[PDB]
């Protein structure tokens, strides 16, 4: 029988705690990132991987975010020196 319902929608930039997000593997940066249309990278914190069973793509919920800046040309994120980026902790959204 017909029924109505609210639906969350996936954020794609300027991510905030509580946003529904798409978590995808960024091969270029050797890391999971949030799917985004904007130039800023949002890298998934390594702590968040085990409970997402990434220890292809996942729906998740932003729990924390931290603004960061690369201080060495050689870094785990493969971003140029001085790049400003976010680290996000997220939990799965089933």
């Amino acid at each position: 029988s017909e029924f109505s319902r609210h639906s969350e929608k996936i954020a794609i930039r300027d991510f905030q705690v509580g946003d529904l997000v798409l978590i995808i593997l960024d091969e270029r940066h050797d890391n999971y990132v949030l799917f985004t249309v904007s130039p800023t990278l949002y890298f998934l914190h390594s702590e968040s991987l085990p409970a997402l069973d990434l220890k292809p793509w996942v729906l998740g919920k932003v729990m924390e975010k931290e603004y960061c800046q690369a201080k060495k040309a050689q870094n785990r994120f493969k971003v140029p020196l001085g790049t400003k980026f976010y680290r996000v902790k997220a939990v799965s959204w089933n």
Binding site: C68, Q69, A70, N75, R76, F77, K84, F85
Partner: peptide
């Protein structure tokens, strides 16, 4: 580390 550091918008 010192690979990257925390930053925030200035207030």
């Amino acid at each position: 580390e010192d690979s990257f550091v925390e930053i925030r918008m200035a207030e």
